[PDB]
Symmetry: D2
Subunit: 124 residues, 4 copies
């Protein structure tokens, strides 16, 4: 359907953070994420979920995903989740907010979690 | 290792929101989630990731997961993500913040995303 | 100083949400805020704080402010705070994230708080 | 009214973070905040707003405040805002979420803002 065909593909933000994702199986997001910033290099596994039967009446399609920042080259002892929605059109977008939590001692737990926003445009 | 054995099991918060998760395969989380609140009934697929080789000296283990609020009988047109960390011990905890986004019109996108906090405690074998 | 002169003035985001602010007295923000969206009409009181001695290493100036959405026209039983930083130069910006909490019963407290992001540019005049 | 009497006083969280606030003037919060954690020493100025005519259906009272982490002792080049609600009664609480932004260069702006929660209990009228 349109949610599957819309989300599936490659997405990039203004900083060149890029992900490749497949949307299907009635709600699964799978793919890989590459950050252009922070303690990260090369690709990280992405897993998430999306609404596979969205309100078709001008609303976006809700979705989210997770990346743990460990791969074969690096481990940043952190994970990020993005929560947002897919909007179609010529300039299709995934508009999100994100939360990045680092593993901490209990003393530093109050400062464990960064928050931000990320808008992705579809590249292929 | 300890992150896999610590995280895997059954977890619930002060409201009775509960999940069952398995941590393995070098950083995968899979399970089911049940909310006691909101436009939700019964169980929903959970998928996420965790740090499979956490810092060695008393830090928490970073993890996150996602639930889209559609299952076999309900669809709330929304998805939540939880980002947080695991800590072990007898009162093991997963301490998180969450973001819940609804599909909206572009005019209403400014009000699409709720935010909150959720501390889960692991059900012990002694239960 | 630079931070007082830079923050002081009229600011608007892409949606036409607008505020007018004065920065002074070693850290005080005072002004009015007008929202183009939501359960809001006319101008609301804004109060906040800023770092009146910011780093001079190229960093922005931290700041934050609060609006309770009650005025003489409307009461939306809610309040928003913005947390962010000011950056000067010809494309001066205040880049923020915000938290909007509504008064709720305990049963609805779990869904009391919205989050978003807001970038403001300086208006003349 | 009960919002003013309710919110005015001394509050603390589980970590010992404490603020002393006066609520009045049809929606003003004024006082000082002391953190027990982080790059903070002694008392900082607090300014905020609250809903001075809240719903009477059992709902909490929306509120928000800001602290810039500059005082006569220290400057941490950052500001925090708390958005939340006051719930009255015999276990009077202020339940909030917060956003802490540091001034940063543009290279570091992506990591400028921390997020958390804070529940406060009233320790003194
Ligand atoms: O990064 C530091 O050196 C200190 C802050 C602690 C964070 C540790 N983890 C990381 O740096 C992993 C990479 C995070 C990248 C973030 C950025 N890139 C994107 O594509 N979007 C944003 C959000 S994601 O969390
Ligand atoms: O309640 C309404 O109908 C208005 C809010 C619109 C959101 C629609 N989505 C839902 O209600 C799905 C359920 C969300 C449950 C939330 C709550 N339960 C938990 O276990 N933790 C929190 C976060 S989760 O997002
Ligand atoms: O989801 C629902 O049906 C209830 C939403 C509850 C929010 C009630 N409060 C309001 O509508 C007051 C106005 C909020 C305006 C928000 C928007 N305008 C801006 O300039 N920036 C954003 C953040 S501000 O909180
Ligand atoms: O890496 C680090 O050292 C932390 C990031 C830089 C933050 C600098 N600012 C500060 O440390 C000022 C103090 C923040 C205190 C926070 C804590 N205390 C409370 O009462 N509640 C929380 C939120 S508040 O922002």
């Amino acid at each position: 359907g349109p949610a599957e065909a819309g989300i599936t593909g490659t997405w990039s933000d203004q900083l060149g953070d890029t992900f490749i994702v497949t949307a299907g199986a009635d709600g699964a997001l799978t793919g890989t994420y590459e950050s252009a910033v922070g303690n990260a290099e090369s690709r990280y596994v992405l897993t998430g979920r999306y609404d596979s039967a969205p309100a078709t009446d001008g609303s976006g399609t809700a979705l989210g995903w997770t990346v743990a920042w460990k791969n074969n080259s690096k481990n940043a002892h952190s994970a990020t989740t993005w929560s947002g929605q897919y909007v179609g059109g010529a300039d299709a977008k995934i508009n999100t907010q994100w939360l990045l939590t680092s593993g901490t001692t209990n003393a530093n737990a109050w400062k464990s979690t960064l928050v931000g926003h990320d808008t992705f445009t579809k590249v292929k």
